[PDB]
Amino acid sequence: ELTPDQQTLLHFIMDSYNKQRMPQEITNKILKEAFSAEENFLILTEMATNHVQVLVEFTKKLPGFQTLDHEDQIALLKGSAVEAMFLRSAEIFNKSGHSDLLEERIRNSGISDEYITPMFSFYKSIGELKMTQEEYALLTAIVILSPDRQYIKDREAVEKLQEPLLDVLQKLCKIHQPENPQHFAKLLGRLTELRTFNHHHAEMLMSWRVDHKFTPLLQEIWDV
């Protein structure tokens, strides 16, 4: 069903999505470091940093992003970082435990259960759609290229980048889940759950600010 131009678009997206590496140096710390609330928090700081790093790298290569107004580019990057990040951490969580040690660190890092619980529900809610890489990539791109973010000046230029991505996803849903015609709608339904992390994340940041220190990049991406 994909047209030549849809294929071309899908390949660019996949090329860029696959260059995203969680560095070994960081995954190594998940086992190699001692556990305490402090060490765990440092590790998470570093992971969050890498997620945002990788988001920027992915974003800048999305077709048409470089043609956007430079202020709108920044608004999209800040607007989408939480959702993009939670989505990526789902993918990493579900594709060795390993996963187990990471889970343990998250659950001991000065984060209240009020936020941990939904985080892990979400990882489960994502994992039973059994999403392919293509689906993760396109969703991430759809999240990033949202015309509904605060401060955007030219919302139409964003919507024109986003819409084609949504078409490609709809067809992919029909090719990889031909027996479930509600799949596309389920993927989009998980986006509304993903959005609830904007509020949770701001609250986690607010309670961490009890003498705790953040990297430069996390300071800029979230204004803190």
Partner: peptide, 11 residues
């Protein structure tokens, strides 16, 4: 917003 992000986008 800011310099670090603009740098990371431009490089």
């Amino acid at each position: 917003e800011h310099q670090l992000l603009r740098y990371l986008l431009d490089k």
